[PDB]
Design a binder for this molecule. Structure first.
Ligand code: JZF
Length: 117
């Protein structure tokens, strides 16, 4: 809902929030791993789920085709670890906009869930 949220923010702008423990291994730029991304909005509503295809997102870290927020999240999460990361416009979409209800200062959060490396 509209208002605030208990999420820790970084100096870059992106935020993070523990959702589920893991105790595996933090991904590293250059290595390929499989993770799950859940498109979440500021209100909390989801507008994108990997479930559509039913399969873990496997790709190479620090050398793929994602936004800063994504790389920053994938280069931090650990195998078996699940946590939500707030990806701002300055590190994702930007002030370019992507819709009427999507302002140039709008922020989007995505849930990262490491499956394996
Ligand atoms: C730079 C993107 O980075 C990636 O390469 C991976 N990525 C996308 O391609 C778009 C995703 C979100 C989309 O589903 C929305 C859907 C509506 C809101 C229209 C808008 C233009 C979109 O595209 C977020 C994402 O992480």
């Amino acid at each position: 809902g509209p208002g605030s949220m208990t999420v820790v923010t970084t100096e870059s702008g992106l935020k993070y929030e523990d959702l589920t423990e893991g105790s595996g291994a933090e991904a590293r730029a250059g290595q390929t791993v499989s993770v799950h991304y859940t498109g979440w909005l500021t209100d909390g509503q989801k507008f994108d789920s990997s479930k559509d295809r039913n399969d873990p997102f496997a790709f190479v870290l620090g050398g793929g085709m994602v936004i800063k927020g994504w790389d920053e999240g994938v280069q931090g999460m650990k195998v078996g670890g699940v946590r939500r990361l707030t990806i701002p416009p300055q590190l994702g979409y930007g002030a370019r906009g992507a819709g009427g209800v999507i302002p140039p200062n709008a922020t989007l959060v995505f849930e990262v869930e490491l499956l394996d490396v």
